[PDB]
């Protein structure tokens, strides 16, 4: 709330920025398209702990990719582990491109949704895993909290919400170029608890370039 002065401009500027980004992996990853394989291999081990290690295993039937872009995570992380996948993104051109990028396994993407997370209500009791990566900084603290609570009602039994995103070492940093905020661990943990979710696991991503923000993965339900 504190670093976002005008909510309408905050969302409007962010939409303008992504409409001017090429629909490629490098566009999704802000010039770091080459770290994608490290990210995916890391995300896979983090997720497989919940799909393969009991007692309360997570299902493998349906997953929701939030901020999916052209489907970078959907192609290499979700589709090989889940029978079905839904995608949601605010940038229409990215969802158009996804149908080419996904290739033959994209036939198992059942629903494409073009709208912001602040407007999206995932269907209740419908998903095993809701994957939210590098998009939470584009939401206000209130909208993130209400979206996550709406995600809680959308989970199947033993389902989890996974947030993987940039985390500041301390405090909150506004990015006035792409109109996004970077939060520290404590601020995000307050938003998660405000959504009524419990923390199951956290993990700091390793093998990333020195200059970039720290990346953490949260498993919630
Ligand atoms: N040469 C130098 N020394 N430069 C000075 C140091 C620069 C360094 N830059 C970073 O750490 C950037 C932060 C981008 C700013 C808004 N995040 N982190 C990555 O690009 C990271 C790597 C792959 C995807 N990644 C995402 O962040 C996902 C992502 C990509 C594009 C736009 C996004 C908008 C919102 C959220 C995520 C976004 C810094 N400490 O600022
Ligand atoms: N408010 C919002 N709601 C939903 N999606 C948003 C959004 N603001 C930006 N986005 C989308 O989120 C993506 C962030 S960068 C792409 C990250 C992607 N999850 C990946 O790991 O490959 C962009 O494609 C952008 O179109």
SS (H, E, C) 155-206: EEEEEEEEEEEEEECCCEEEECCCCEEEEEHHHHHHHHHHCCCCEEEEEECC
Query: Whose atoms come closest to the Cα of 96: which ligand?
Result: 2
**Positions at the binding site for S-adenosyl-L-methionine:** 67, 72, 89-91, 117-118, 133
Residue with tokens 């839904």: 86
Torsion region of 158: left, alpha or beta (phi above 0 gives left; psi -120 to 50 gives alpha):
left
Q: Is residue 42 a contact partner of residue 205, using CB atoms and an 8 Å limit?
A: yes
Atom of ligand 1 nearest to the CA of 32: 23
Buried b or exposed e, range 151-179, using 16+ CB within 10 angstroms = bbebbbeebbbbbbbbbbeeebbeeeeeb
Burial readout 29-39 (b: 16 or more C-beta within 10 A, e: otherwise): beeeeebbeeb
User: 57: which 2 tokens?
Assistant: 């295993």
18 lines ligand 2 (CB under 6 A): yes
Residues 6+ apart with CB under 8 A from 42: 205, 206, 207, 217
Distance of CA 51 to the CA centre of its chain: 18
Closest CA to 65 of 38, 90, 85: 85
Cα-Cα-Cα-Cα dihedral of 90, 93, 97, 99, to 10°?
60
| Whether residue 176 has its Cβ less than 6 Å from ligand 1 | no
Among the bound ligands, name the one nearest to the CA of residue 69: 2
Within a 13 Å sphere around the CA of 141, how many CA atoms are in the beta-carbon half?
Answer: 18
Phi, psi of 55 (to 5 degrees): -80, -30
What is the distance between the alpha carbons of residues 190 and 196, in angstroms, rounded to a whole number? 10
What angle, rounded to 10 degrees, do the helices at 141-153 and 185-194 form?
A: 50
Binding residues: 67, 72, 89-91, 117-118, 133
> Considering all CA atoms of the chain, what is the largest pairwise distance in Å, rounded to the nearest integer?
46
Residue with tokens 């009791």: 125
Q: Determine if ligand 1 sits within 6 Å of the CB of residue 175.
A: yes
């Amino acid at each position: 709330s504190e670093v976002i002065e005008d909510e309408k401009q905050f969302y409007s500027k962010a939409k303008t920025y992504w409409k001017q980004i090429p629909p490629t992996v490098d566009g999704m990853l802000g010039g770091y398209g080459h770290i994608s394989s490290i990210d995916i291999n890391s995300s896979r081990k983090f997720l497989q702990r919940f799909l393969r290690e009991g007692p309360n295993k997570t299902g493998t039937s349906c997953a929701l990719d939030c901020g999916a872009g052209i489907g970078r995570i959907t192609k290499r992380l979700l589709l090989p582990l889940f029978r079905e996948v839904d995608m949601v993104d605010i940038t229409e051109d990215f969802l158009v491109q996804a149908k080419t990028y996904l290739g033959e396994e994209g036939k198992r993407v059942r629903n494409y949704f073009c709208c912001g997370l602040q407007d999206f209500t995932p269907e209740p009791d419908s998903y095993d895993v809701i994957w939210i990566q590098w998009v939470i900084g584009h939401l206000t603290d209130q909208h993130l909290a209400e979206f996550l609570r709406r995600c809680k009602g959308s989970l199947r039994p033993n389902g989890i919400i996974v947030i993987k995103d940039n985390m500041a070492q301390e405090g909150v940093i506004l990015d006035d170029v792409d109109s996004s905020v970077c939060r520290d661990l404590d601020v995000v943990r307050r938003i998660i608890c405000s959504a009524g979710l419990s923390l199951l696991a956290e993990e700091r991503q390793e093998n990333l370039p020195d200059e970039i923000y720290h990346v953490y993965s949260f498993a919630l339900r």
